[PDB]
């Protein structure tokens with residue numbers, strides 16, 4: 001049996017996680033859901049609680065904590081440990097019953113639980129790319145300290161890459177380690193992208209797109225922040241750095257390819273030039289499940305891929321002029337040091353501003369660019385604790401700086 | 411230090427084998443070509459001997475044995491063991507300084523060397539699908555005895571599938587072994603096809619197609635026999651059975667897909683519905699190479715795949731009315747027993763008849779079908795000496811039956 005905790009369970013990733021767990025459990029009793037953890041969504045959390053009956057429930061916010069104890073009372077013969085805040089999260093991460101944790105918390109906030117889960121030697125099914133981007137070499141140092149802890153990528157492209165690998169090679173090393181790509185004989189990564197909703201617009205249309213146009217479409221079924229990031233292709237930008245860190249592939253060996261059918265989720269080119277790819281309908285259940293079953297696979301009753309019915313698959317290069325966030329991400333990755341933290345932090349603010357119609361499309365890249373130009377490289381701390389503090393302060397600094405730049409230009 | 415013998419060195423597979431070995435050795439001096447074996451192409455073999463200086467040369471047609479011996483004296487610093495016939499082949503198969511044997515010998519004939527290589531516990535990089543189709547159950551039995559013998563598929567769709575598998579599991583089993591697909595979590599196989607030259611033709615056009623049509627318009631440079639089989643899609647029919655035997659996959663779990671671009675060379679659907687595919691330009695060098703380096707990869711200077719330039723990939727289901735050879739293969743496969751041997755044997759005749767302009771395109775399938783319809787199930791010999799003999803008997807019966815069906819009509 002596999003004991004699983006779901007962090008951010010009422011969000012997009014967490015809901016998908018619960019679905020695929022539920023559907024698989026109907027075939028064989030594979031998973032136990034031992035913990036749920038959300039931020040405010042007490043009601044939605046309670047409904048999941050009703051059905052899954054986890055031993056642990058937790059809400060980050062204290063203000064909604066009382067309400068949650070009361071709702072839960074309604075459920076008969078169920079008496080769960082009801083916790084709150086960072087404290088509850090640490091209690092969960094350190095339970096001896098929980099084996100694997102799904103981190104579906106959004107933004108830089110997700111780093112906090114990702115680190116405690118590693119410190120506690122857990123398998124971490126990590127959806128939250130903001131954490132790898134902003135805290136890559138820290139998480140690297142944390143994995144070397146806690147040798148049994150593992151990060152298994154849930155981000156669809158990174159799961160796709162991971163599936164295409166020989167696990168006998170993978171087991172010799174692990175995600176986020178130095179030399180991962182050499183052990184696995186990886187030569188190059190094709191990073192697939194939907195292209196987002198703005199893929200066909202001219203530069204002059206781009207100047208005037210609003211947040212509503214970015215959120216509009218039914219094909220983009222995720223949280224509001226990653227939706228916006230898909231529209232600017234900053235999401236792919238962030239996934240380029242995530243690839244660098246998860247697999248230790250050089251930036252010049254990562255190629256972004258727009259594939260609007262979203263069947264081929266990414267491809268790995270090996271040193272012999274043979275390329276391997278993972279394909280399925282655009283669905284996050286596959287990558288979630290794999291991270292929980294890896295290095296094995298289990299039966300699902302998901303719709304099989306009908307290749308004849310999909311019929312056509314297209315590939316083209318993205319326009320760097322229409323999507324300059326991409327180039328910014330490459331520049332920040334290549335620069336190294338804390339430039340990825342700076343990139344991610346300033347994006348968080350520039351993203352939110354566009355979402356709230358406070359800035360225009362091309363301002364996003366304008367803002368992120370000026371913050372990266374302002375940053376001064378710091379020597380990287382040797383001890384984990386000071387590196388952690390260093391990242392927090394640099395992330396906080398960049399948000400502050402983006403807020404200055406924004407305010408100076410409006 | 412990989413010591414490789416090349417059987418069929420002068421044909422299309424054998425040539426591509428030497429090409430990839432040549433280019434790979436310019437990077438890393440891995441490969442020793444220890445032996446070369448051909449039928450009659452002595453000047454072509456002499457030109458190859460000179461380049462690769464093998465410890466053994468073997469010519470099958472003994473009438474040209476003196477010619478070979480006398481061309482070879484023109485080579486400096488060279489003193490090879492020069493052998494001929496079956497006995498020459500047997501000697502090579504038993505030599506300890508030979509680890510891997512590439513079988514690029516066409517037709518049923520290739521089963522002899524395949525069997526002897528297995529009996530000497532070699533790794534057999536097998537291009538000759540005819541031996542798997544005629545003698546699948548026997549090869550299986552044989553590999554169960556010579557436990558260190560391995561068959562690694564060289565056929566590109568099968569190498570593709572082989573590559574898509576997770577080697578952490580492949581190493582725990584081997585091709586042609588019970589439970590291969592259970593162990594590897596294989597749900598189904600998408601077996602890809604170029605579709606041949608006749609893929610757009612109506613039925614009335616198909617009636618009239620000739621061998622000149624099939625040979626000028628081919629999708630890859632190959633031997634005449636597979637070229638013709640590609641035109642009728644009997645090749646794919648054969649490959650459906652080769653898949654069944656190599657990978658222990660149920661017939662109703664193998665789906666033929668026409669992919670005219672031939673970038674995707676085949677796809678494996680795993681029990682979770684996730685699909686993994688192998689991709690490269692149309693080439694045989696990689697499938698060959700991988701058969702020779704598995705479980706490892708090595709560097710090549712092959713041109714890397716450029717998905718963006720490729721731009722479009724298409725798929726569709728083949729039509730069984732236009733390509734009845736496919737349907738006959740499933741039927742032979744599903745019936746089991748010696749039906750696949752009959753299918754292969756009668757195809758060898760019909761293919762050749764059409765090649766030589768004696769019969770029409772629908773006569774190929776029509777002749778094969780009658781011979782299949784005529785064959786009567788036999789009890790399967792439980793020992794290897796005998797099963798081999800039984801296979802030879804039926805094979806030559808089916809060949810003679812096909813020829814009789816032709817003679818009684820033209």
Ligand SMILES: NC(=O)C1=CN([C@@H]2O[C@H](COP(=O)(O)OP(=O)(O)OC[C@H]3O[C@@H](n4cnc5c(N)ncnc54)[C@H](OP(=O)(O)O)[C@@H]3O)[C@@H](O)[C@H]2O)C=CC1
Pocket residue numbers: 007008009010011012013014037038039040041042060103104105106107109110127128129130154155156221222223224226284
């Ligand atoms: N959604 C997708 O298809 C994909 C998502 N990702 C990544 O996965 C992550 C999650 O994205 P997504 O699911 O879209 O986002 P959502 O906004 O839909 O979900 C975020 C979840 O995190 C919870 N949460 C936020 N802060 C905290 C906290 N402080 N403590 C505990 N829980 C918290 C939210 O709780 P509450 O409901 O109470 O507010 C919610 O359940 C992102 O980092 C994203 O980049 C990556 C690839 C695909």
Ligand SMILES: NC(=O)C1=CN([C@@H]2O[C@H](COP(=O)(O)OP(=O)(O)OC[C@H]3O[C@@H](n4cnc5c(N)ncnc54)[C@H](OP(=O)(O)O)[C@@H]3O)[C@@H](O)[C@H]2O)C=CC1
Pocket residue numbers: 417418419420421422423424447448449450451452470513514515516517519520537538539540564565566630631632633634636694
């Ligand atoms: N070519 C391709 O891309 C593919 C080929 N295959 C398979 O590979 C096999 C070979 O095909 P291909 O190379 O196209 O065929 P070719 O006709 O080009 O070559 C056959 C080779 O085998 C040699 N040969 C034939 N009979 C004997 C024998 N009695 N003893 C020793 N050598 C012999 C020939 O020698 P000689 O030159 O002296 O006549 C020749 O070198 C076939 O079974 C085919 O199905 C499978 C997938 C792809």
Ligand SMILES: Cc1ccc([C@H](CCC(=O)N(C)O)P(=O)(O)O)cc1
Pocket residue numbers: 155156157192193194195196219220222226229230231233235236262282284
């Ligand atoms: C259909 C679909 C799949 C993937 C995405 C990507 C965004 C979401 C994501 O990162 N996933 C699913 O991993 P994008 O960055 O390629 O636009 C969008 C839409």
Ligand SMILES: Cc1ccc([C@H](CCC(=O)N(C)O)P(=O)(O)O)cc1
Pocket residue numbers: 565566567602603604605606629630636639640641643645646672692693
């Ligand atoms: C480009 C190309 C790929 C595959 C083929 C097949 C025939 C040869 C073959 O089996 N190969 C290359 O594995 P087909 O049966 O699909 O037509 C021809 C041309």
Ligand SMILES: [Ca+2]
Pocket residue numbers: 164165166572573574575576577
């Ligand atoms: Ca593999």
Ligand SMILES: [Ca+2]
Pocket residue numbers: 783784785786
């Ligand atoms: Ca009968």
Ligand SMILES: [Mg+2]
Pocket residue numbers: 155156157239
């Ligand atoms: Mg993604």
Ligand SMILES: [Mg+2]
Pocket residue numbers: 565566567649
């Ligand atoms: Mg083939």
